[PDB]
Every structure is written in C-alpha cells, then in structure tokens.
C-alpha cells in the first residue's frame, strides 16, 4: 500500500491535545488547530512488516480472528472476514472467551443444536408458547457468538481495529503468547501490543482500506 490512498482516507487526522497519551512520543508529527497530526512517514514501513508477518503466518494455515465493535465498522469488518476466509466478532467481546474457552465451546454446541432445531422443521409443533422466545434467543446468541461457530480452537495471530476500545481482549491475548496486530491512534497504549500502525480509528474509509489491504495480504499469502 502507498501513502496516497491512506492520506485520502484521513489517516493523519486524529484527536485533540487534551487526550494524548505521552507513551507515543515518536508517533506524532505536529499540532494543527488544537488537534494532533499523526506522522505518516513513519507508519508505512511498520505496516509493511505487519502485513509481511500476517501473510507469513496465514500461509501456514494460521487462523486469525477479527475484532471490532464500533457501530460504524461492525458490518465492514464482518464482510471483510467473510470474504477473507477467517472469523469475526461484532457485538461486545464476552470477557475471558479465550481464557475460558472450555465453557464457551458448550455455548457453541448448544448454538449448533438450536440451529439444527431451527432448520429441522420442528418449530411449529410447539403450542406457540416457546417458539417465539426460542427464536429470539437464537438471534441474540448468534449476534453474540455466531461468528466463530465453526472455528473450533485457538488462533495463532490476532488483529484488532481501535485496540484501546477492545483492551480487554488484548489482555487475554498477552496471557497466552498470541502475537497481536492492531492500530492505535493518539489516545491508546502502545506497550501491550508489539505491532503498531498509527492512524485514525473512527472513519469508515480507514477501516475499509485497512481491511482491503489485509484481505489482499492473505490472498497473496495463501498462494504459497
């Protein structure tokens, strides 16, 4: 990827000076109208090694999971993962789903059972007293954990948009030695993650081109 399209998306535009984390001193260019301007000359090579490691680990059948719960980016990341032969999560991250996988897999199994019940021609013999509420439980639970139903294991890498808002997940990432690739703007902590690509994390355009670059990266990785 080149600087032109990411500049078009608005990567330089960031947050004001009242909410800047001093942990990212070299990740800044200057101040322009009471809002920080994120440096772009030092963000493309790091993104290059990030993509290189991503496709290197994807070429080895390395499953990765996509995290994003912003209301302006849930559908975009969901579609990117769907077209990116990987897994995704949209709603609130169930705390400890990694460190307590042996309990979440039971919910996965009961989701499969209820899915079979739904597509089994069975939800009509009920006396209209539980079918509707069971259906409601179905869409709630598929919105919750229906994106990793067939995942059946642990990831090798992990990719997050707007790392700060999903800090919880990153913690469980560091509890198990899973490398993390994430993008942090001017109000995040760059110590808990070893793959930093500074940029905006609020515009739909930003997440779209980031997901497109990730998708192309896994395309070229899988052809090895």
Give the C-alpha separation, 217 to 54, whole Å.
7
What is the closest distance, in whole angstroms, from the C-beta atom of residue 51 to RNA in the complex?
Answer: 29
Helix, strand, or coil (residue 100): coil
- Per-residue tokens: 173: 């990432």
Among 26-34, 45-53, 101-109, 151-159, the segment contacting RNA (CB under 7 A): 101-109
- Shortest Å distance, C-beta 61 to RNA: 27
- Smallest separation (angstroms) from RNA to the CB of 139: 9
Nearer Cβ to RNA, position 53 or 172? 172
Q: Assess 140 for contact with RNA (CB under 7 A).
A: yes
What is the nearest approach in angstroms of RNA to the Cβ of residue 46? 28
Nearer to RNA, 32 or 112 (CB): 112
Give how many residues touch RNA by CB under 7 A. Answer: 20
For RNA, the binding residues in 51-80 under the rule CB under 7 A are none
Q: Is 94 in the site for RNA (CB under 7 A)?
A: yes
Hey, how many other C-beta atoms are within 10 angstroms of the C-beta on 191? 10
DSSP 110-172: HHHHHHHHHTTT-TTSS-SSSHHHHHHHHHHHHHHHTTSTTT-S--SSEEEESGGGGHHHHHH
Beta carbons within 10 angstroms of residue 73's beta carbon: 23
In the set 99, 116, 122, 135, which binds RNA (CB under 7 A)? Answer: 99
β-strands 35-37, 13-16 pairing: antiparallel
Interaction of residue 102 with RNA, rule CB under 7 A: yes
If the CB atoms of residues 3 and 132 are measured against RNA, the closer one turns out to be 132
135 binds RNA (CB under 7 A): no
Of 218, 106, 93, 102, whose CA–CA distance to 160 is shortest? 93
Nearer to RNA, 32 or 140 (CB): 140
23 binds RNA (CB under 7 A): no
Q: Which stretch binds RNA (CB under 7 A): 24-32, 87-95, 123-131, 201-209?
A: 87-95
Q: Is 66 helix (H, G, I), strand (E, B) or coil?
A: strand
The encoded tokens of residue 149 equal: 């139903």
Do 159 and 63 touch, CB atoms closer than 8 A?
Answer: no
Distance in angstroms (rounded) separating the CA atoms of residues 69 and 91 = 5
Within residues 156-195, the interface with RNA by CB under 7 A covers: 168, 171-172, 175
Q: Which residues bind RNA (CB under 7 A)?
A: 91-96, 99-100, 102-104, 106-107, 133, 136, 140, 168, 171-172, 175
């Amino acid at each position: 990827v080149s600087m032109r399209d990411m500049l078009k998306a608005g990567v330089h535009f960031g947050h004001q000076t009242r909410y800047w984390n001093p942990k990212m001193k070299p990740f800044i260019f200057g101040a322009r109208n009471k809002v920080h301007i994120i440096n772009l000359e030092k963000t493309v090579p790091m993104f290059n090694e990030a993509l290189a490691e991503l496709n290197k680990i994807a070429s080895r059948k390395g499953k990765i999971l996509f995290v994003g719960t912003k209301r302006a980016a849930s559908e975009a990341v969901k579609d990117a993962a769907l077209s990116c032969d990987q897994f995704f999560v949209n709603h609130r991250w169930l705390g400890g789903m990694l460190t307590n996988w042996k309990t979440v897999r039971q919910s996965i199994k009961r989701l499969k059972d209820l899915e079979t019940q739904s597509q089994d021609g069975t939800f009509e013999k009920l006396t209209k007293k539980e079918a509707l509420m069971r259906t409601r439980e179905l869409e709630k639970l598929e919105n919750s954990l229906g994106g990793i139903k067939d995942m059946g294991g642990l990831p090798d890498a992990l990719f997050v948009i707007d790392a700060d808002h999903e800090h919880i997940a990153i913690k469980e990432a560091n509890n198990l030695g899973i490398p993390v690739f994430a993008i942090v703007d001017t109000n995040s902590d760059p110590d808990g993650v070893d793959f930093v690509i500074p940029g905006n994390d609020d515009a739909i355009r930003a997440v779209t081109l980031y997901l497109g670059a990730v998708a192309a990266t896994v395309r070229e990785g899988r052809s090895q």
